[PDB]
Amino acid sequence: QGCAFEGESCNVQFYPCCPGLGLTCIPGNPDGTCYYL
């Protein structure tokens, strides 16, 4: 139901990383942590 910021848990179905911020969801399989590149 939203998007995640750096350092926050992500899930590619429910809570992808918020865009425009360099964030990748690692590992994102489907869960990860939003990491800055």
Buried b (16+ CB within 10 A) or exposed e, 2-35: eebeeebebeeeebbbeeeeebebeebeeebbbe
Residues 6+ apart with CB under 8 A from 27: none
* CA distance linking residue 1 with residue 22, whole number of Å: 20
Domain containing residue 20 = 1-37
| Torsion over CA: 21, 36, 9, 30 (sign) | positive
| Total tally of structural domains belonging to the chain | 1
Measured in angstroms, the resolution is 0.9
Beta carbons of 15 and 33 less than 8 angstroms apart: no
* Strands of the sheet with 23-27, listed across from one edge: 9-11, 31-36, 23-27
* CA distance linking residue 13 with residue 6, whole number of Å: 18
Q: Which technique was used to obtain these atomic coordinates?
A: X-ray
Nearest partner of 9 among 37, 23, 20, judged by Cα: 23
